[PDB]
Amino acid sequence: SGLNIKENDLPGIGKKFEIETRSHEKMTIIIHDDGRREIYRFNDRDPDELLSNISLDDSEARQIAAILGGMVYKPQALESIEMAFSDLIIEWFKVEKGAKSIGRTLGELDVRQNYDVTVIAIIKHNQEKLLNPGADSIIEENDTLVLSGERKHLKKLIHD
Amino acid sequence: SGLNIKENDLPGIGKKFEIETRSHEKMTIIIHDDGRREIYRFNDRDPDELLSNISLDDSEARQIAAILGGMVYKPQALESIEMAFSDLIIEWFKVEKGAKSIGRTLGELDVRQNYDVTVIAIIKHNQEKLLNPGADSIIEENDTLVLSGERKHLKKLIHDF
Ligand SMILES: Nc1ncnc2c1ncn2[C@@H]1O[C@@H]2COP(=O)(O)O[C@H]3[C@@H](O)[C@H](n4cnc5c(N)ncnc54)O[C@@H]3COP(=O)(O)O[C@H]2[C@H]1O
Ligand SMILES: [Ca+2]
């Protein structure tokens, strides 16, 4: 369930992350300051044996990271997640029928000001994602809100 | 970009993404509705030859993605990026000497309202990072603002403040 990750500075070059999974599999990610990533996969039992490696530019790396991280397709069973080494909880809430928010804006609800919750995205029924909504974003039926904040504050906002 | 991506539905399982790089390297990511991911790497000249594979749970996939995506260590030389699967831009902007925004709050500057730019993080001179700042976060002398928005809007904000 829990990763082991060893990080080391590569002075003037970038950083190195050596990851070991629950499955007993090893991956090393080198991030260069110019944006290039190199990934190496090693034999579990014999880490001197390289299994595969790949180079990626900054754009490629971020696209793959968005897919892997559930930013393109979100696993349907996960309703909330908790960041490692953090209390920050991200929660996906679908506005039901007859919620008081329906038809009202982020500014009118004053979500961040009055609840300390940040709406980081809005998923429409047509499934397009609006990133960083602002005060004038209207909340509608069946829209999914992507909320970031502390659990206490999230419960409060949802309850209201 | 530089990536050929194909997405297909896997009924009762989740989704499959087949990715091919600019340099013609290929991987397949399976994303389960239960949170599990598997990643497969294949020979670029023979898609049926498996080079390696790895199995991950949701928390692991998210941590690895954050490393891969530059959210743990940022490549130092990058000043801005075109966001993945978006037309939005992310820019790192260092507030320097005599900048008129210094000592003023995001509320008072009213950045998102007036410039349609979202400050998504603030990184102080000492590399400490504040995620999703609010109206009461104060802009200070050597801060780096992590800005998100459209090209035209970013240019006006930087020019004005
Ligand atoms: N991270 C950031 N980056 C750039 N500028 C920032 C910012 N945080 C706050 N501001 C600026 O401060 C003003 C006051 O924000 P506040 O959170 O008090 O009051 C907000 C908040 O209660 C609500 N709101 C707007 N967008 C929101 C979102 N994405 N999530 C949650 N609440 C939001 O609407 C009110 C008015 O927002 P508006 O944008 O007109 O005005 C905002 C915005 O111009
Ligand atoms: Ca208000």
The number of the ligand nearest the C-alpha atom of B135 reads 1
Rg of chain B over Cα atoms, rounded to whole angstroms, equals 20
Residue B62: which of B82, B35, B40 has the closest Cα?
A: B35
The closest of A119, A99, A95 to A107, measured between CA atoms, is A119
Q: Say whether B60 and A21 touch across the interface (CB within 8 A).
A: yes
- Can you tell me the distance from the alpha carbon of B27 to that of B47, in angstroms, rounded to the nearest whole number? 9
CB distance A111 to ligand 1 below 6 Å: yes
User: Strands A4-10 and A14-20, how do they pair?
Assistant: antiparallel
Report d(CA B31, CA B38) in Å as an integer.
7
CB atoms within 10 A of CB A137: 16
In order of A84, A113, A120, A129, A142, the CA distances from A154 in angstroms are 18, 13, 13, 21, 19
Q: Which helix (H) or strand (E) holds A80?
A: strand A80-82
Our CA-based measurement puts residue A82 at a distance from the nearest CA of chain B, in whole angstroms, of 8
Residue type, position A95, single letter: V
For domain B80-160, give its CATH number from 1.10.357.10, 3.40.50.300, 3.40.50.920, 3.30.70.1450.
3.30.70.1450
CA dist B63 and B71 (Å) reads 10
Burial of A87 (0-12, 13-18, 19+ CB in 10 A): exposed
Q: Which residues contact A148 (CB under 8 A, 6 or more apart)?
A: A88, A89, A90, A117, A118, A119, A120, B132
- CA A116–ligand 2 middle distance (angstroms): 12
| CA closest to B17 among chain A residues | A67
**CA-angle at A126, arms to A121 and A129, nearest 5°:** 20
Tell me how far apart the alpha carbons of residues A111 and A119 are, in angstroms, rounded to a whole number: 8
Supply φ then ψ for residue A7, to 5 degrees.
-110, 140
Task: Please choose, from the candidates B29, B27, B32, the residue with its C-alpha nearest in 3D space to the C-alpha of residue B11.
Answer: B32
Interface A-B, measured as beta-carbon pairs within 8 A, has a size of: 196
Is A133 touching ligand 1 by the criterion CB < 6 Å? yes
| Strand positions, DSSP E, chain B | 4-10, 14-20, 26-32, 37-43, 46-56, 80-82, 89-94, 118-123, 129-131, 144-149
Q: Which atom of ligand 1 is nearest to the CA of A108?
A: 34
Here the tokens at position B59 are 């928390």
- A135 close to ligand 1 (CB < 6 Angstrom): yes
- Residue with the two structure tokens 């009202």: A104
Nearest to A37 by CA among B28, B91, B74, B5: B74
> Can you read off the two tokens belonging to residue B97?
């000497």
CA separation (Å) from A28 to A88, A102, B32, B50? 26, 46, 24, 19
Place of tokens 């002075």: A11
Q: Which residue type does B117 have?
A: V
Q: Please give the method by which this entry was determined.
A: X-ray
Q: Would you call B61 and A68 a contact, using CB atoms and an 8 Å cutoff?
A: yes
Burial label, A99 (beta-carbon count in 10 A; 0-12, 13-18, 19+): middle
Ligand nearest to the CA of A114: 1
Closest listed ligand to the CA of A106:
1
Q: Collapsing DSSP states into helix, strand and coil, what is residue B142?
A: coil
Q: What one-letter code names the amino acid at B16?
A: K
In chain B, the residue whose alpha carbon lies closest to the alpha carbon of A32 is B75
Resolution to one decimal, Å: 1.9
- Contact B134 CB / ligand 1 (< 6 Å): yes
Tokens, residue B49: 């030859």
**CB within 8 A of B108, min separation 6: which ones?**
none
Tokens linked to A5: 């990750």
**Tokens 């998923």 map to which residue?**
A123
- Domain A80-159 CATH (choose: 3.30.70.1450, 3.30.70.20, 3.30.70.940, 3.40.50.880): 3.30.70.1450
Q: Which of A6, A20, A31 to mutate to test the interface with B (most CBs of B within 10 A)?
A: A31
Residue B134 Cα, ligand 1 centroid: separation in angstroms? 7
Q: What is the C-alpha to C-alpha distance for residues A129 and A148, in angstroms, rounded to an integer?
A: 16
Locate A2 and state its tokens.
Answer: 């829990």
Sequence-separated contacts (24+) of A20-29 with Cβ below 8 Å: A21/B54, A21/B55, A21/B56, A21/B60, A22/B57, A22/B60, A23/B54, A23/B55, A23/B56, A25/B54, A25/B55, A27/B54, A27/B64, A29/B64, A29/B67, A29/B68
A109 close to ligand 1 (CB < 6 Angstrom): no
